[PDB]
Symmetry: C2
Subunit: 273 residues, 2 copies
Amino acid sequence: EIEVINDGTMIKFKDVESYENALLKVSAMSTSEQVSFLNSLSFKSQMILMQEADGELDKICNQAADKAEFDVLYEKYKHKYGDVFMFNTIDATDLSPYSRLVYVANEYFVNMKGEFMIGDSLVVDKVYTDFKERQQQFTVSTRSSVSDLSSINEAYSRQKDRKVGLYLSVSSGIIHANFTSQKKGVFGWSRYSTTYHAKVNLRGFEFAQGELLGYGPVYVNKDGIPFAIDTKEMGGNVTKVFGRKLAQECTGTIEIWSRGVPYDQRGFATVRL
Amino acid sequence: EIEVINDGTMIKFKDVESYENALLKVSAMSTSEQVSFLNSLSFKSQMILMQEADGELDKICNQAADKAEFDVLYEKYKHKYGDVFMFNTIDATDLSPYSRLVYVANEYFVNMKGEFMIGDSLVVDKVYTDFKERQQQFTVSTRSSVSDLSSINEAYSRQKDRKVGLYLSVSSGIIHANFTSQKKGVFGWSRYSTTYHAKVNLRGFEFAQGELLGYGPVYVNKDGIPFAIDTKEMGGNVTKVFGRKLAQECTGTIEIWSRGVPYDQRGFATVRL
Ligand SMILES: [Cl-]
Ligand SMILES: [Cl-]
Ligand SMILES: [Cl-]
Ligand SMILES: [Cl-]
Ligand SMILES: [Cl-]
Ligand SMILES: [Cl-]
Ligand SMILES: [Cl-]
Ligand SMILES: [Cl-]
Ligand SMILES: [Cl-]
Ligand SMILES: [Cl-]
């Protein structure tokens, strides 16, 4: 038996067996079935609040005309849900509220204080102290990592058994590029030959164009001119004069992929030279 | 003019113009053309050493019968190249030596001490203090991150505009699962409905099988039995009784992907419950 006590503010189970059984039966239902089974019991659990919280976040993203308006709405939203729920302290672009619960499926029966009862025993369910405790791990290593536009002068894409990079530096107006590629073997990562592919869009820039039809290498103006680099097969450590600076600042973006790293998985970087 | 002095141990350029020109012309050549142009000058540069270092690492991976033998070979290799070159201090599976040079294309002309000359001026080229200084960045954010088998009880795949996760925890033998999914909007990440896909291979495990043909939910033995989970469309925060422990330890692996995150980009995790 499931009993709603303390004027619809507490779920009480007969014993451990009743609780574990109700958890299995309720967690196996569809969201609508769960919402209706809880409506049957006239009990608002943390799960019903999560439905509401998620519904309200989706509506805030739809009514907000601009960032400043969203910021006003979202501050009120966080204040509203930021006590029962927890927000992402690592990535501030992740807007969603989170359960504080370690034993996640208990969300169906815990109340607004994270409580439920087994007979005369009160269970204050196990919670995370902070969001960082939930995502905490001893590892630094990942299967895959691809750089975004917040990476400065360094673009990479490390996949499961192939890596590619484009590293930029500048000495007296001369821009140096390092094209890199590795393959995962039985003993680890080692350099291997590949074809490099880049998409360069830079301001105040001259490209060090390679020899073509017996003309060049020559500095070709690419000031705000997007262009592509599709090399021939080369080693895993290629060093090149990438170009020169025409102005005080050389800004823009770079994208890098290879024969082994597909365009979809290309690495990005903002250029500041 | 390019002049090899101090009995083939130093490259001397006439002026800055000669150096910048030779750097452009040499960096635009093919690897073989560069190796031959340097052989023409009877000068061994850091570039020729990198060719040798890379060639020797590839040969060590081919002659090593096992890890312990490689370890003996690779210790001697590191000692040999670990002064002129730099090894990866962050990822120990990355075996390759690295240039200490900031201005990478200078590898063609720098000697074994990272030197070259402009007339009577000696240039001790700019180097990185440590490997960490080369990979150093202020950002924590990436475009893409996928967990590997070193991630314990948490598998994820965060792509450019879609995320998926499978988080496991255990309370008194009852295993709790959290299936998560987010989409990137104009204001950031928010929850959205998707179809989840998992590949589970666990020891000492009973799966909490959902209702099928009016039978269950029921605990089905999956002790060392690989099996798949292909859900129907569900929200971005699904909580489930995943199963139960049959023994003292529940170990194995989990793989997670979704309708938005393709199988290729599926996240991994080792399970220890
Ligand atoms: Cl009452
Ligand atoms: Cl990006
Ligand atoms: Cl400069
Ligand atoms: Cl090209
Ligand atoms: Cl390849
Ligand atoms: Cl001499
Ligand atoms: Cl992996
Ligand atoms: Cl346990
Ligand atoms: Cl299934
Ligand atoms: Cl989708």
